Amino acid sequence: IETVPVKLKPGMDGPKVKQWPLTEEKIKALVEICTEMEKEGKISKIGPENPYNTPVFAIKKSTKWRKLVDFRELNKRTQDFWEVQLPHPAGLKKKKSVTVLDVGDAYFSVPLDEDFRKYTAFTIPSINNETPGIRYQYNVLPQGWKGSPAIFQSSMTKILEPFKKQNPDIVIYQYMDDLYVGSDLEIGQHRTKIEELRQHLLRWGLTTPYELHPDKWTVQPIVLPEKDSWTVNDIQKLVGKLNWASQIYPGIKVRQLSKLLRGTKALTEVIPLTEEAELELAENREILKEPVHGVYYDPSKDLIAEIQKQGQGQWTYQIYQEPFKNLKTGKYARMRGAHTNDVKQLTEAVQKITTESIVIWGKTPKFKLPIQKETWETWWTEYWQATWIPEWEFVNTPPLVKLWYQ
């Protein structure tokens, strides 16, 4: 009932991001949604003297439409003041079970500082420039603004303090609109304690509409092929891959293996693995089991995720902050189902990686995505269920990172 003064970082003007053209379906859903939000007083219509703008999209998260606002820019221009404005538990990655709750509707009770409201302005585009958009700004704490959990924290600690006293071994982490609740309980007990908390929140006026298992994640080790008859080409590939790996694990050796190729030989020639080359390859399989050494997480530095299309629904990914110092690696799979496509799977992978990243370190990684920029901006909202949006950019996958990470 009383607002909290909010500042931009000093000497910094609000956002002027461009609204993306939307389909008539998505516009009609935004107008319906925004008409109701205007009746409930959460947003109001603004005049030409407000020059700011934040993009809006319509996603599905269900068969009713949600409205997702891209506060990525307003978050750069303020939330870091809210990243330092008045915390991440490292045990949440260790919990056997983790459940994600959407608590973003609690935000629509707290008024927003009337002097900051101009920065939340957004536009519902018209088709073909018939009209200028319908323009609104926010009166309440908007979802996706990183200052919303920052301001609501005090109320949310208050609501959760009962539950934390009772279940002292359960981990509760909040990131934006989500609570991450982790326990070591049996699955069935876990789902019960989740319902207990869900009911607790609903009892105090917190409308809440995902189960993860970080005890199964790891940093995927490199696997070398196991063949029955080797060709010159198989050894060349094997030697090439082990050569790449030796920038990472240092004790890998290739002398005895490339000795097998001495002289100019046809690529299809079958070479038998001598006893020495087998020992070198066996010793090299063993050094790939142990992990990397000096790969530590620097909280100040940015996390970067790289993704490789592998064929047949497989997608590999790496999270690192400095090249070759991989904090996590993994591979994703889609059950296809003759309704799958490259963009559905890329969009699903980005969300998995981002969730996984949030649990471990509490921040989203900046993605290098293997897709044409203009294709992403058109179709990403068709499978985006998450309420957050990571930073991203577009790249051309190198020719050998596909197979070495395969």
Partner 1 sequence: PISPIETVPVKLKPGMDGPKVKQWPLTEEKIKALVEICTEMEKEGKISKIGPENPYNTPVFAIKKKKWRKLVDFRELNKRTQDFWEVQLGIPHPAGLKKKKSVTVLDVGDAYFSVPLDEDFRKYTAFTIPSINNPGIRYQYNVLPQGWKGSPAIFQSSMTKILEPFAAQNPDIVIYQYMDDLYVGSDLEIGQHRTKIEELRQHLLRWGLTTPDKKHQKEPPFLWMGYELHPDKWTVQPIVLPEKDSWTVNDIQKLVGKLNWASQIYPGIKVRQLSKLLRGTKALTEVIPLTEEAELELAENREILKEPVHGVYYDPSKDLIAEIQKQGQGQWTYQIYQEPFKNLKTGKYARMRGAHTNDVKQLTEAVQKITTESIVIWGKTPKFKLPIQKETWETWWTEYWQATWIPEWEFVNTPPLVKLWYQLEKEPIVGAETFYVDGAANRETKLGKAGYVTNKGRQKVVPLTNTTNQKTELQAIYLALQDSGLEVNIVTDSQYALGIIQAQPDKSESELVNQIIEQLIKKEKVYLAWVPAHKGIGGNEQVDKLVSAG
Q: 97-102 and 178-183: which strand pairing?
A: antiparallel
Secondary structure class of 198 (helix, strand, coil):
helix
Find tokens 């690696």 and name the residue.
329
| 320 vs 357: CA distance, rounded Å | 11
265 touching partner 1, by CB under 8 A: yes
Rg, C-alpha atoms of the chain: 25
Window 88-127: residues binding partner 1 (CB under 8 A): 127
| 102 vs 366: CA distance, rounded Å | 23
400 touching partner 1, by CB under 8 A: yes
In this chain, which stretch among 153-161, 197-205, 221-229, 258-266 interacts with partner 1, using CB under 8 A? 258-266
User: How far, in Å, are 185, 210, 232, 265, 271 from residue 268 at the CA level?
Assistant: 55, 50, 6, 9, 9
250 touching partner 1, by CB under 8 A: no
Of the CA atoms within 13 Å of residue 39, those in its CB half-sphere come to 5
Give the contact letters, 222-241, x = binds to partner 1 (CB under 8 A), - = no. ---------x-x--x--xx-
8 touching partner 1, by CB under 8 A: no
Which one, 360 or 369, has the nearer CB to partner 1? 369
The answer to whether residues 70 and 55 touch, using CB atoms and an 8 Å cutoff, is yes
Q: Which of 263, 272, 294, 337 binds partner 1 (CB under 8 A)?
A: 263
- With 0-12 CB in 10 A as exposed, 13-18 as middle and 19+ as buried, what is 376? middle
342 touching partner 1, by CB under 8 A: yes
Residues whose CB is less than 8 angstroms from the CB of residue 39 and which lie 6 or more positions away in sequence, other chains included:
none
Window 176-205: residues binding partner 1 (CB under 8 A): none
Q: Which of 254, 305, 358, 360 binds partner 1 (CB under 8 A)?
A: 254
| 256 vs 161: CA distance, rounded Å | 63
Q: Which of 1, 39, 62, 129 binds partner 1 (CB under 8 A)?
A: 129
Window 365-384: residues binding partner 1 (CB under 8 A): 369-372, 374-375, 378-379
Confirm or deny that 215 is annotated as ligand binding. no
Which one, 100 or 277, has the nearer CB to partner 1? 277
Confirm or deny that 178 is annotated as ligand binding. yes
Window 26-65: residues binding partner 1 (CB under 8 A): 27, 46-51, 53
Q: What is the dihedral of CA 258, 262, 266, 272, to 10 degrees?
A: -60
Cβ 80 to partner 1, closest distance in Å? 22
Question: Which residues of this protein are in contact with partner 1, per CB under 8 A?
Answer: 21-25, 27, 46-51, 53, 127-132, 135, 231, 233, 236, 239-240, 243-244, 254, 258, 261-268, 308-309, 311, 341-343, 345-346, 369-372, 374-375, 378-379, 396-400, 402
Residues marked as binding? 102, 177-178
